[PDB]
Nucleic acid binder design. Structure first.
Lengths: 76, 116, 137, 174, 97
RNA sequence: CGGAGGAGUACGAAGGUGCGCUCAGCGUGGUCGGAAAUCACGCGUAGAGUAUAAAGGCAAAAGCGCGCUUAACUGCGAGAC
RNA sequence: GCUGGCGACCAUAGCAAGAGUGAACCACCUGAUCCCUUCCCGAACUCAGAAGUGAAACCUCUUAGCGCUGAUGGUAGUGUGGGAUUACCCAUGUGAGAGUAAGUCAUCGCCAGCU
């Protein structure tokens, strides 16, 4: 007999909106377990580190700051 | 050595970042054992809108390093900012305790008529 | 018998053996060496037998460097056991060999003696080999 | 001391070390006393005895020091008091050091107990003296089992020789 | 003086994986010459000539002359690539000296 | 019926907020006190910690303290996964 | 041109060593009355100040010393079509990582004070 054979259900994480797409307020941009990406201008952060848009506009990704973090923002 | 200043900027960082995130005009104040300084800065954080300090010719002949001079500098910055056209600002203590000369400057500005 | 003193995991996937040996194809310790020109597997027993033959031929007059180590475990099913019911038990350890991999080097021995010892050793190995010497570049 | 050091010993040290700037002249910063009374978890009264003792010795309220990290070999663990300590700066350290240099060395059993060695290598000097008497405190009556205290002096003297020079000028026995 | 290598030009249509494999099937060897004050130049050599030159120890310390047409370059051998299993030379670097 | 591990809880503070603080290791000196308790000073360093398994994270620290407290609310909710 | 504050950017920008500045500023500095503070301490936070100093610390300049950046060429991998089956070859498109030549002791904005 074996002692293995367990696994958990999938969680479906990942980027939902890519750069250059238009969004409306409330749209979810990234699903992530930890803060792989950080919230920029017009982007909010949920209690499970989800990133969502707080304005209408166009999504942009970049690398900024002294620690070299990855940021996502919405341009109006 | 140097740890006083490093700690002070470490304490100032959180308030400065929160003010930047809110996007409000900032009233940043600096203190030194001899003088006091105050500036009004745009929300983006790159352009100075107004300034006032004891180095001005009006006060440079006085004590320049106590509560009385802080009140006058607060009145001066309030008047100059009101003339420039800013009304609602967020106060930035830059890691100093909200007390003494800092508090006097803030109170003088509020009395002068900047709502915060 | 060579074997890792400790391992993080007992059993590993089979994998695939492809490519050439860009690392470990240059003589670095001795003056003369034997390298494989064909790909395959080398077991701990084979490594031990080849080392013993080379040492006996060269009469312990020089140093022998072994540059292959068996760190991949291989499992087998107990026998008369049907398919399924989990992975089998570990039986022996092997080292993956890609063409160009140097197996043994010899230092401090005459070239004719070294070639004789390597010729003796090659008859114990499951792949074709060749003899190389140190060069400037 | 105090004015004694400021008016006299400053020039004396300046001429002794031939150092140009007055800010280079060594000065004593702080005095730290410690009792690390371990195994207190078994009894719990020796610790209050010790804090009362140092409160008597020095004119300040001592602070108890808890543990960091847990050692199974000893009976010690993270968040409980293991020792206690006092620090002194300014006039308090000058007065305490004067009382030390004056009245401690006569009342000890064996002289020569202190050395010009035991320098940290940067000008700070630590000495551990057994017994809590040699101070103007109450005698064996009204105190618990006697305890020994460690005292460290921390100064602005850069190196060992300057530390020794300042010590010699102040008048430690060694 | 002692060592002269005859080379041809290697134009842009003769660069890449396929072209290099075709050259080595034709039994030639691609090589690159770089060094101070000038732009790198790509050339091709003969395997037999290269092997003969490498057969001697002094070749790795002397200054050699590579001639392609009328021009001539004075260089030293800087790097060398070999086939892992056959030991045949495959590429060469020359630094201008 | 492939290879490895966890869960069937805990907490009125281990929740909220304002203010404040940096770990771990080593080398030195110093009563019992040593490899290892506590004290002081230097050196390279996130290798510590995060109630609990692992992964993704953590300087505005998401790690660690103190004062006051109950937003561990009621009615909802554009828009998304 | 020097000094202070706030940013842009986040090692070609950093670290380490060496040297320099007190007119102003900055820093060290004096005191503990009053405001305020230490699970002890005017050390830190805070107030009242000007006898001292540029020692420390911060800023500025020099150095390739560590670090960092980094070609060209070749090699590995790979989409499509064909030929083969220890997993490679041909046509066509694409193309690293490591290493080499080489480079680096940053570059800009807003305001205020001095010569």
């Amino acid at each position: 007999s074996t002692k293995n054979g367990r696994d958990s259900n999938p969680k479906m994480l990942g980027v939902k909106v890519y750069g250059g797409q238009t969004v409306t307020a409330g749209n979810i941009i990234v699903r992530q377990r930890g803060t792989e990406f950080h919230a920029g201008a017009n982007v909010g952060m949920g209690r499970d580190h989800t990133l969502f848009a707080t304005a209408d506009g166009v999504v942009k990704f970049e690398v900024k700051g002294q620690f070299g973090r990855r940021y996502v923002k919405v341009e109006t | 050595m140097n740890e006083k200043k490093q700690s002070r900027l470490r304490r100032a960082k959180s308030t400065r970042l929160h003010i930047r995130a809110l996007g409000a005009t900032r009233l940043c104040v600096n203190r030194t054992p001899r003088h006091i300084y105050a500036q009004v800065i745009s929300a983006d954080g790159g352009k100075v809108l107004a300034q006032a300090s004891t180095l001005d010719a009006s006060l440079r002949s006085g004590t320049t390093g106590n509560i009385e001079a802080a009140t006058k500098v607060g009145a001066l910055i309030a008047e100059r900012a009101k003339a420039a056209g800013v009304t609602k600002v967020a106060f930035d203590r830059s890691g100093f305790k909200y007390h003494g000369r800092i508090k006097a400057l803030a109170d003088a500005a509020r009395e002068g008529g900047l709502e915060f | 018998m060579l074997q890792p003193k400790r391992t993080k995991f007992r059993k590993v996937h089979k994998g695939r053996n492809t490519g050439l040996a860009h690392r470990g194809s240059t003589v670095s310790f001795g003056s003369i060496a034997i390298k494989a020109t064909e790909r395959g597997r080398m077991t701990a027993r084979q490594i031990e037998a080849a080392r013993r033959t080379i040492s006996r031929r060269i009469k312990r007059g020089g140093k022998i460097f072994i540059r292959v180590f068996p760190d991949k475990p291989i499992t087998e099913k107990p026998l008369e056991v049907r398919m399924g019911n989990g992975k089998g038990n570990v039986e022996y350890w092997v080292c993956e060999i890609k063409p160009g991999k140097i197996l043994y080097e010899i230092e401090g021995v005459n070239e004719d003696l070294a070639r004789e010892a390597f010729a003796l050793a090659a008859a114990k190995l499951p792949f074709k080999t060749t003899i190389v010497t140190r060069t400037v570049m | 001391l105090k004015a004694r050091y400021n008016d006299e010993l400053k020039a004396k040290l300046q001429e002794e070390l031939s150092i140009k700037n007055v800010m280079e002249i060594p000065r004593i910063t702080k005095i730290t006393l410690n009792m690390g009374v371990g195994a207190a978890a078994t009894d719990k009264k020796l610790l209050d005895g010790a804090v009362a003792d140092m409160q008597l010795i020095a004119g300040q309220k001592p602070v108890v020091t808890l543990a960091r990290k847990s050692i199974a070999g000893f009976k010690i663990r993270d968040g409980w008091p293991i020792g206690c300590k006092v620090t002194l700066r300014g006039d308090q350290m000058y007065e305490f050091l004067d009382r030390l240099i004056s009245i401690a060395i006569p009342r000890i059993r064996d002289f020569r107990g202190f050395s010009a060695k035991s320098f940290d290598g940067r000008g700070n000097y630590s000495m551990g003296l057994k017994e809590q008497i040699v101070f103007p405190e109450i005698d064996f009556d009204k105190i618990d089992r006697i305890r020994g205290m460690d005292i460290t002096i921390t100064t602005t003297a850069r190196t060992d020789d300057e530390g020794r020079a300042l010590m010699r000028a102040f008048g430690f026995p060694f | 003086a002692n060592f002269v290598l005859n080379a041809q030009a290697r134009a842009e249509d003769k660069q890449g994986k396929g072209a290099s494999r075709r050259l080595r099937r034709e039994s030639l060897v691609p090589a690159i010459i770089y060094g101070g004050n000038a732009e790198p130049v790509a050339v091709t050599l003969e395997l037999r000539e290269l092997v003969k030159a490498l057969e001697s120890n002094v070749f790795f310390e002397e200054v050699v002359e590579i001639k392609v047409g009328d021009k001539v370059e004075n260089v030293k051998i800087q790097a060398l690539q070999r086939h892992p299993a056959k030991n045949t030379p495959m590429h060469a670097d020359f630094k201008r000296a």
